[PDB]
Amino acid sequence: PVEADISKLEPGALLRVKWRGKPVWLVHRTPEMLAALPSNDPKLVDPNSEVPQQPDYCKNPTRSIKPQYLVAIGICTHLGCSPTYRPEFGPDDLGADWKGGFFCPCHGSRFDLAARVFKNVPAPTNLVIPKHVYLNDTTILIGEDR
Amino acid sequence: PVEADISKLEPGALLRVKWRGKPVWLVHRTPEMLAALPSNDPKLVDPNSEVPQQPDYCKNPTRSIKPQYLVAIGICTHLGCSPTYRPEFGPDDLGADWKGGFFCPCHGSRFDLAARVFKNVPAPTNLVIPKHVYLNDTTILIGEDR
Ligand code: FES
Ligand code: FES
Ligand SMILES: [Cl-]
């Protein structure tokens, strides 16, 4: 397992740590980012995380233990590129209704800020969330849980 | 880093985990084993761990964070063989005054239960102790400390 120190992870920032040769992202979500997540539901493939792409303690609307932080494996579920992080709302290239999320540059799959995949892109499932647990408020252990 | 679950490590037992290609041993020491350590001092090369073969939080008489468990890399400091674990006191082959420890089969180097090397053997230093930290009472994370 690897320890992720989020003590300096500012609002909207993304921290990358390596685990089992894979990139693990930790995103500090703002209330604004969180407020828009439910609105994505109708446009998502698996808004309720029914596909087991995460431990049960992350099978929820924000796919996380705490709303303030998203923890997920930064690998596209289509073929494995690493998606770009696009937290800004409504950029011209992604559409005015874009509420922040991730965009895979290899074949266009899109995921929201709970790493849930949108309908009709090559990726068929929400990004994988690894087992993890908070050791304390500013330290998340990735790879193992209680 | 590598997690070592010592929840089932009984008194006197030794757990082996692999870290960076190296064998890491975790030994559950009994009070009897601990009681005998100071007596080895006069016969040891570096009883106070002056040679930096370990992190500072292990630079002490039991070369460990807690007395109950010894954590060390199981590689002989002489030429690299893997020492045998000999916890029993006074076996005929090692001597009646033997208080438990390690015996390297390749050229006879001896180390005590704090992994400290005895005088006049081929190995010149105490076995290396890797950086590590307790995640909780029965879980040790090897390869990192904070
Ligand atoms: S690898 Fe991500 S859209 Fe194909
Ligand atoms: S390698 Fe251990 S005594 Fe030589
Ligand atoms: Cl081994």
Author numbering:
A (entry chain B), B (entry chain A): 49 to 194
Q: What do the study authors state?
A:
Rieske protein PetA, one of the three subunits of the bacterial cytochrome bc1 complex, functions as an electron transfer pathway in the photosynthesis of photosynthetic bacteria as well as in the respiration of aerobic bacteria. The globular domain is exposed on the periplasmic side of the plasma membrane. TtPetA consists of two domains, an iron-sulfur cluster-binding domain and a large domain.
The structure is well superimposed on those for homologous proteins of other species, especially with bacterial ones. The redox potential of the monomer fraction was determined to be 320 ± 4 mV. This may imply that other interactions on the interface also contribute to some extent to dimer formation.
